[PDB]
Amino acid sequence: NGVVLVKSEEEFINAMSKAQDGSLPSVFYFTAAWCGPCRFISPVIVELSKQYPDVTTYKVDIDEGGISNTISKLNITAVPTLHFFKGGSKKGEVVGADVTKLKNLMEQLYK
């Protein structure tokens, strides 16, 4: 129920099970060591996890082997990318650095 690093296929499958079938409030944060804007978004996501403590944000490094195919099977076109889930279905897909949309969605969905 905070920021959770996802490094393996198993961990991602479990996280998506919680977000979809499990209907738990879940955000997927796709990042990379080479992502410039993620350098100031990652801290923002940490502070937001304290504001919305029941949400789980799964932080995904797209360069990670093991989840190598999950990424290509997700059509990730840019880092950062954020996927928002509530009630078991996707409520948002913020592609690129847009913290306004991130904050608007966190409040609208998980307040």
Numbering used by the authors: 3 to 113
Task: Give sentences from the paper.
TRXo1 and TRXo2 share high levels of sequence identity and similarity (74% and 97%, respectively) and their crystal structures are quite similar and overlay well (RMSD of 0.9 Å).
TRXo1 crystallized in the orthorhombic space group P212121 whereas TRXo2 crystallized in the hexagonal system and belonged to space group P65. Well-diffracting crystals of TRXo1 and TRXo2 were obtained with one molecule per asymmetric unit (a.s.u) with Matthews’s coefficient (Vm) values of 2.3 Å3 Da−l and 2.0 Å3 Da−l corresponding to solvent contents of 46% and 40%, respectively. Their structures were determined by molecular replacement at high resolution of 1.80 and 1.50 Å, respectively. In both protein structures, almost all residues were well defined in the electron density map, except the first two residues (Met1 and Glu2) of TRXo1, which were disordered (amino acid numbering refers to the mature protein without its mitochondrial presequence). The distances between Cys37 and Cys40 Sγ atoms are 2.03 and 2.05 Å in TRXo1 and TRXo2, respectively. They represent the typical length of disulfide bonds, suggesting that both TRXo isoforms were crystallized in an oxidized form. The region containing Trp36-Phe42 residues including the WCGPC signature in TRXo1 has a different conformation to that in TRXo2 and is shifted by approximately 1.9 Å. On another note, the fully refined TRXo1 structure contains 130 water molecules whereas the TRXo2 structure includes 92 water molecules, of which 51 have equivalent positions in TRXo1.
